[PDB]
Design an enzyme around this catalytic site. Structure first.
Site, mmCIF file in Angstrom:
data_model
loop_
_atom_site.group_PDB
_atom_site.id
_atom_site.type_symbol
_atom_site.label_atom_id
_atom_site.label_comp_id
_atom_site.label_asym_id
_atom_site.label_seq_id
_atom_site.Cartn_x
_atom_site.Cartn_y
_atom_site.Cartn_z
ATOM 1 N N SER B 203 0.829 -1.209 0.000
ATOM 2 C CA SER B 203 0.000 0.000 0.000
ATOM 3 C C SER B 203 0.865 1.263 0.000
ATOM 4 C CB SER B 203 -0.983 -0.013 1.183
ATOM 5 O OG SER B 203 -1.892 1.070 1.121
ATOM 6 N N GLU B 327 -8.908 -5.511 -4.526
ATOM 7 C CA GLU B 327 -8.221 -4.365 -3.931
ATOM 8 C C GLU B 327 -9.140 -3.344 -3.257
ATOM 9 O OE1 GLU B 327 -5.119 -3.672 -3.415
ATOM 10 O OE2 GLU B 327 -4.024 -5.168 -4.584
ATOM 11 N N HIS B 440 -7.503 -5.856 0.306
ATOM 12 C CA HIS B 440 -6.245 -5.118 0.418
ATOM 13 C C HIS B 440 -5.447 -5.477 1.676
ATOM 14 C CE1 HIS B 440 -3.838 -1.878 -1.188
ATOM 15 N NE2 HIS B 440 -3.883 -1.175 -0.070
#
Ligand SMILES: CCN1CCC[C@@H]1CNC(=O)c1cc([N+](=O)[O-])c(N(C)C)cc1OC
Ligand SMILES: CCN1CCC[C@@H]1CNC(=O)c1cc([N+](=O)[O-])c(N(C)C)cc1OC
Ligand SMILES: *[C@@H]1O[C@H](CO)[C@@H](O)[C@H](O)[C@H]1NC(C)=O
Ligand SMILES: *[C@@H]1O[C@H](CO)[C@@H](O)[C@H](O)[C@H]1NC(C)=O
Ligand SMILES: *[C@@H]1O[C@H](CO)[C@@H](O)[C@H](O)[C@H]1NC(C)=O
Ligand SMILES: [Cl-]
Lengths: 533, 535
Positions: B203, B327, B440
């Protein structure tokens, strides 16, 4: 004399000719006048009913072809010549043809009226692919086809004027339709069962008769093959029609009344010579003189009329061929020819898009390129070729058809949809064109039933299937054979399931979504773009 | 010293450390936790670049994790493991610039390739002390030296008044760089090879890795890079100087505060007051947007990441990039009406349109419509299940999947060796609902080898799966190639090229090669959408 070949209509007597079909004889009545010859001061004018005649009128041969441009791109090539005039050119061309079973039907028989295509600039009802003898002999149908004025003679308009009000070629069709109402019963036809069917411009015409109140009492069902009244090529505005008209005048050396007068002194070919020179952009699938939104024949744009109409009483059969846009490419797009495989660069694909979508802004053309590029193979010439054809076919036919089918079904109409996927064994265009615009026609008309044409025995069986769909639809509004109880059946197109069938050598296959994602791009997104760019 | 473990005593530039012997499932590892690499950025040093840690006297105890950098604490689902696992597990403080080191026990004989982990958390949160960043398994099983550092997040790390000297911005990125320099000088004392340093992060940590590639004074500090579900390019990772300045003076107003007099007032504010008003400076109602992120300053970042990526020579670079299957799914519950973890989140078309405006907050009405028309299933444009999955896909593609595809493509075309993956395995232990798929950040626990710990209830297959991933990451760190040079019996992982666009699926089954990183849809986001918005 054969009393089967003798018919009395409201204008006098006709003599038909007995023709040979592979399964028996048919009666043909060719070259019947439905209008006063639109010559001299009648150029650009609405048609007038044909005056009565004395004695017996010879109706055993095709009359003249409406004066039109003649294609010279591939001289002697049977793929282009097959659409070229097979009779003499003349402004005296308002005649129709009738095929009927021999002997004439004992009971009132459903009528199919064919309206030819040719981009509103060409065409004739005398072409071999429109031979109505097979449908008359095999399915016992009464088939009618008329000539209507094309090009300047049919659609040159100075909107608001009295001497060129526009859409006279459409009025020619309507008069032929009225003629059928008044006269078809004398041949055995049922005036209370009249189905219009046409391809390309002819389908657009059929569509416009649906959208014009005076025409709506002249037929009961409609078939639109690869053509729509809505879309980018089938209509123009009053302003653009007026513009192209005075430009053509300026080109030939010519106040409305004064302008039309000088135009009427001009030999026919002088008008045809400058016909292609009045288009506002370099383009393909675009024609100079087409129907005009006049506020009369067309009270509004076809888009506005299909959005707001009630089609509860309507029954339609619409569809497309597999490769709608392929052959328009050789008529303007650099890199394309019928003599090679037309593998193109990427720069050529962007160039062809400005021509295939000539009204697109820079941004809109970009959107088209990015949508049609296969990003797995963004420079593969084979893919770039196949997509250029797809851009043209979807923009001009497939999506306008999907748009029409959707509005009609949503607003009451009974809609049946197809895609024609069989390529003729006798096609003379290259293989890269696949199934080109207008090559379903010879199968609907039943040509493969003639052994001298060298079709395959599987194609012959295929043709017979299509004639049943088309004729059963004419009889019922439902193309499904009421004798065959096999499943699958042909289901109606709805806004929910979006079902349509594929027409080919294999049994019917039901599919869903008619280019749904891509046509949403054309029908829903692009308008928002151009109306802001 | 004298009565303690002699294998846990190490000297670094700043002084002496005593580490701790930790138990991994297959043996012991050495851990050195809470090593200061900077002077505490407190008081008059808030917003300031970090100064290296001044040497200490005696033996620094390095057996516990140190303070977590001051940050926002997620309260959306109190008690819920799915959120708590990312929350701070140590005390919050501005005195938080410490790093951690895991090595084999006893320490390596030959110089050993180093892995440096950079945590994510949208630049507003995160800690190197979290359980999912446990370096003990990689160190034990693969014999790796692993380094993780704390870096300042939120206001304390990224509040900027561009051009000023009291708040130049990007200081959270300078903390990371300082830790990279610390590794260059000191990692040999642990058996680490400062000539084989591989960065990896997820990330915002991935974006951080990307920015180190694009910033010159960082390129001498590492040799290879791994970017998991994050890019320096894209819509959330950076802001302009003008936007950063704008958000900075607004936050000042919200708390009670010439750039000098303004920053001076902010320094008088309690850390919590800054955290309490952090989310209130965003320009639009949004998800996947963070108030204080790296700024394009013409210094650390000479130009926009997109500009640097388009015009850079990357022949020296070797990168591993990739994404998870879903995601965007969990960003939806943090601001898109109709989404919850406690129901199926089936939404209406109207909710879909409203959510697109939130998920794509910079979109004009026309651009927003373009998004909706692309992601609509015109065969079933009102199906609540499809609309739910499409909302997730919009957020996922816009923020991660397409920036990654864009990054991979430009890097590959410009010299770099690129390996690309998609991670498609959902943990059997995932507490998020099924509709979120593989969300995610849920590849991390597998890369670190947590399924090896039998007390965590992973399956035998997930354990075997975790070892494969550790192999890939470590092989890539060692060689610049995730493939095993002594294993033809296993399928190969080909580099990502412009010509072929190959990447691999990461799941319970053997490697499968695929072509195209969402080629069509990413053409829309990366090629068409920019042209549109600039009109
Ligand atoms: C419907 C018209 N088709 C059907 C059968 C034969 C004919 C084929 N030719 C065309 O459709 C055709 C098109 C264009 N154009 O703009 O698309 C054009 N231009 C501009 C020179 C010329 C064309 O033929 C002479
Ligand atoms: C980015 C931080 N994530 C990653 C790991 C766990 C943690 C979960 N929380 C989030 O992703 C998160 C997101 C948003 N947002 O903008 O998408 C947000 N807003 C607008 C208040 C708040 C959030 O958490 C409190
Ligand atoms: C095909 O022929 C035309 C003219 O004959 C030409 O313009 C075009 O470039 C040719 N295509 C190829 C691939 O050679
Ligand atoms: C799920 O919960 C949220 C918040 O409580 C609510 O807005 C939404 O309507 C719910 N969705 C369904 C399908 O019940
Ligand atoms: C694993 O399973 C056992 C058996 O029910 C349970 O007691 C334990 O709490 C579980 N541990 C985790 C981390 O889920
Ligand atoms: Cl116009």
């Amino acid at each position: 004399e054969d009393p089967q070949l003798l018919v009395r209509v409201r204008g006098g007597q006709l003599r038909g000719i007995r023709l040979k079909a592979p399964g028996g004889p048919v009666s043909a009545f060719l070259g019947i006048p439905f209008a006063e010859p639109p010559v001299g001061s009648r150029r650009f004018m609405p048609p007038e009913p044909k005056r009565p005649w004395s004695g017996v009128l010879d109706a055993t041969t095709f009359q003249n072809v409406c004066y039109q441009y003649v294609d010279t791109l591939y001289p002697g090539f049977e793929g282009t010549e097959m659409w070229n005039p097979n009779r003499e050119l003349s402004e005296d061309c308002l005649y129709l043809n009738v095929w009927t079973p021999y002997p004439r039907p004992a009971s009132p028989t459903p009528v199919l009226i064919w309206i030819y295509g040719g981009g509103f600039y060409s065409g004739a009802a005398s072409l071999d692919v429109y031979d109505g003898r097979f449908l008359a002999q095999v399915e016992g149908a009464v088939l009618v086809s008329m000539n209507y004025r094309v090009g300047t003679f049919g659609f040159l308009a100075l909107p608001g004027s009295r001497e060129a009000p526009g859409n006279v070629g459409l009025l020619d069709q309507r008069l032929a339709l009225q003629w059928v109402q008044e006269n078809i019963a004398a041949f055995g036809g049922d005036p209370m069962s009249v189905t219009l069917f046409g391809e390309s411009a002819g389908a657009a015409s059929v569509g416009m008769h649906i959208l014009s109140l005076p025409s709506r009492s002249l037929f009961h069902r409609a078939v639109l093959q690869s053509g729509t009244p809505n879309g980018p090529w089938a209509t123009v505005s009053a302003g653009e029609a007026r513009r192209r008209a005075t430009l053509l005048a300026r080109l030939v050396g010519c106040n409305d009344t004064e302008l039309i007068a000088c135009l009427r002194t001009r030999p026919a070919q002088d008008l045809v010579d400058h016909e292609w020179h009045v288009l506002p952009q370099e383009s393909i699938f675009r024609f100079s003189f087409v129907p005009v939104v006049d506020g009369d024949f067309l009270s509004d744009t076809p888009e506005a009329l299909i959005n707001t109409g009630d089609f509860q009483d309507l029954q339609v059969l619409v569809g497309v061929v597999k490769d709608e846009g392929s052959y328009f490419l050789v008529y303007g797009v650099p890199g394309f020819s019928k003599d090679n495989e037309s593998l193109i660069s990427r720069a050529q694909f962007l160039a062809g898009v400005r021509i295939g979508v000539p009204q697109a802004s820079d941004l809109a053309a970009e959107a088209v390129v990015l949508h049609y590029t296969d990003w797995l193979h963004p420079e593969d010439p084979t893919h770039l070729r196949d997509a250029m054809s797809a851009v043209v076919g979807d923009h001009n036919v497939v999506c306008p058809v999907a748009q029409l089918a959707g509005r009609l079904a949503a607003q009451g109409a009974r809609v049946y949809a197809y895609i024609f996927e069989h390529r003729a064994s006798t096609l003379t265009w290259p293989l890269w064109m696949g199934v080109p615009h207008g090559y379903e026609i010879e199968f609907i008309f039943g040509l493969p039933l003639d052994p001298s044409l060298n079709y395959t025995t599987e194609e012959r069986i295929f043709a017979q299937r299509l004639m049943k769909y088309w004729t059963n639809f004419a009889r019922t509004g439902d193309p499904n054979d009421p004798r065959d109880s096999k499943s699958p059946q042909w289901p109606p197109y709805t806004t929910a399931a979006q079902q349509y069938v594929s027409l080919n050598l294999k049994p019917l296959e039901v599919r869903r979504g008619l280019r749904a994602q891509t046509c949403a791009f054309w029908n829903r997104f692009l308008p928002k773009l151009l109306s802001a760019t």
